[PDB]
From Swiss-Prot:
Keywords: Acetylation. This is Protein LURP-one-related 15. One of its GO terms (molecular function) is protein domain specific binding. Coiled coil: none annotated. Disulfide bonds: none annotated. InterPro entries: LOR, LOR_sf, Tubby-like_C. It holds the Pfam family LOR. The keyword Acetylation applies. Might be related to the phospholipid scramblase and tubby-like superfamily of membrane tethered transcription factors. The keyword Acetylation applies. Belongs to the LOR family. GO terms for cellular component: cytosol; plasma membrane.
């Protein structure tokens, strides 16, 4: 129940995330510094779409906007819809969920660096933010949890703050 984007983005040990900023084009890498994804606006003069790229520049997911849809790779087609995010904090429904139990939810505060992601029908914590051009927080992704999936929520939490 931890695979959302691709089972390949699921490690057997916890992965700490980090955001670094050099119009929301920034990077999320691990805390040692290795780039996990590059986050960018796909079109100049268009702030409602962002794309997560791996280090080869290949699109992993595309987020398109109080409501966001996240798509496979570099697409915005309904046939590539992975999940929808609705603004206790954020609720996450996978594509097949056409109705009203969340598959995941986000609670806590972005500015307090207390974001925590929970699996719906189990309430298991799958990711946890900790307060520390690096931003003032880390996000631990727990084993077998899809870290590309957690990265978009970070992207979405950052979208709401900005």
């Amino acid at each position: 129940g931890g695979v959302v984007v691709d089972p390949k983005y699921c490690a057997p040990y916890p992965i700490d995330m980090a955001i670094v900023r050099k119009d929301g084009n920034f990077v999320i890498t691990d805390v040692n510094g290795n780039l996990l994804f590059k986050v960018k606006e796909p079109v100049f003069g268009l702030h409602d779409k962002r794309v997560l790229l791996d280090g080869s520049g290949t699109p992993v997911v595309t987020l398109r906007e109080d409501r966001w849809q996240v798509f496979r790779g570099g697409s915005t087609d309904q046939r590539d819809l992975l999940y929808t995010v609705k603004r206790t904090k954020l609720d996450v429904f996978l594509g097949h969920n056409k109705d009203k139990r969340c598959d995941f939810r986000v609670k806590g505060s972005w500015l307090e660096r207390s974001c925590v992601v929970y699996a719906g029908e189990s309430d298991a914590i799958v990711a946890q933010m900790h307060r520390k051009g690096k931003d003032n927080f880390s996000v631990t992704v727990y084993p077998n949890v899809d870290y590309a999936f957690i990265a978009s929520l970070v992207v979405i939490l950052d979208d709401v703050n900005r």
